[PDB]
Design a protein around this ligand. Structure first.
Ligand SMILES: CCNC(=O)N1CCC(Nc2ncc(Cl)c(-c3c[nH]c4ccccc34)n2)CC1
Length: 332
């Protein structure tokens, strides 16, 4: 008979294709609920993400269309691949949800962060972020929102990025984390390719320090936590900020904060063997080239890939037009 069946998964219903069996919730996010399942056809495990009426507003719609499109276009070993897309509804009028099926990963970075990693694995994961980011950049896509929760890995230490970043208001219950947003993004002062390097540096640091580098309730708190450790930026950086903002920043208590050996002591890095000793320094060296406020002085993706620590691996539519656009893309 029908091709789909429904299964309860908490406070929602997953009406998926019969080929997917033994649904099990693996995570929750902004777009919706995500489940792990077994695909009888391909004979392998996969992940199923359900988009509940993605056209309910421009915020969710824009993300869904953009996701659905790039997920189909872009292709790279370090960017989650889409295996299938479907909708249990038969017509546009009936259209409601969109299900995305992808390879199943074992976990996201939030989990890896809570554990110590030899230099071999840490550098490898970091190397895969740079590749993926490099690919996204070579496609004209500047993520700008890379974070531990949007990056997943497998046991064999393989890594893939989940989403494609940004391109505003929502009644949603949960907020979005911004601890990894680059300075230029926080101060809206224009950005470039190396804007992602800042995020990678925040993640690498968290992997070391095992704790969020720049916490904070709002961007006000976040900026302080940034200068409180790295120190007030140089003048050349100030003269590149709109006065409405250059005022707020320049009228903030200066710092000339601590150096890197202080921020990331040898205690955090394994310095038992001579090999690990050298890797520590190289690691801290890269950290110091990525955690730089001024983009003009922040290392780039290609130079970061050449770093010895890493080279060892070398418009506005209506909720009716959106439904249309999204439905068409789904029905390839
Ligand atoms: C139980 C704690 N382990 C984890 O951190 N996770 C998160 C990653 C999950 N695996 C996975 N594999 C593929 C995709 Cl496409 C997604 C995924 C995509 N978007 C998500 C939003 C929230 C949580 C997970 C996802 N997630 C497994 C459980």
């Amino acid at each position: 008979d029908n091709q789909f069946y429904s299964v309860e998964v908490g406070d929602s219903t997953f009406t998926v294709l019969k080929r997917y069996q033994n649904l099990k919730p693996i995570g929750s996010g902004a777009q919706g609920i995500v489940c792990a399942a077994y695909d009888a056809v391909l004979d392998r495990n996969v992940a199923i993400k359900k988009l509940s009426r993605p056209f309910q507003n421009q915020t969710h719609a824009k993300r869904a269309y953009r996701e659905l499109v790039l997920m189909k276009c872009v292709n790279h070993k370090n960017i989650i691949s889409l295996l299938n897309v479907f909708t249990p509804q038969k017509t546009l009028e009936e259209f409601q949800d969109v299900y995305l099926v992808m390879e199943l990963m074992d976990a996201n970075l939030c989990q890896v962060i809570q554990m110590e990693l030899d230099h071999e694995r840490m550098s490898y994961l970091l190397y895969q972020m740079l590749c993926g980011i490099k690919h996204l950049h070579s496609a004209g896509i500047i993520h700008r929102d890379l974070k531990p929760s949007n990056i997943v890995v497998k046991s064999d230490c393989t890594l893939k990025i989940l989403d494609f970043g940004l391109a505003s208001f929502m009644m949603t219950p949960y907020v979005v984390t911004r601890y990894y947003r680059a300075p230029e993004v926080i101060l809206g002062m224009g950005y470039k390719e190396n804007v992602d390097i800042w995020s990678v540096g925040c993640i690498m640091g968290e992997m070391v320090r095992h704790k969020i580098l720049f916490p904070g309730r709002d961007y006000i708190d976040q900026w302080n936590k940034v200068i409180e450790q790295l120190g007030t930026p140089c003048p050349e950086f100030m003269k590149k900020l709109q006065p409405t903002v250059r005022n707020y920043v320049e009228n903030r208590p200066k710092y000339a904060g601590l150096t890197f050996p202080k921020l990331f002591p040898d205690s955090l890095f394994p310095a038992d063997s001579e090999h690990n000793k050298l890797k520590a320094s190289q690691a801290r060296d890269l950290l110091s080239k990525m955690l730089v406020i001024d983009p003009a002085k922040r290392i780039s993706v290609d130079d970061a890939l050449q770093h010895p620590y890493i080279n060892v691996w070398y418009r506005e539519h209506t909720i009716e037009e959106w439904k249309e656009l999204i439905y068409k893309e789904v029905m390839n």
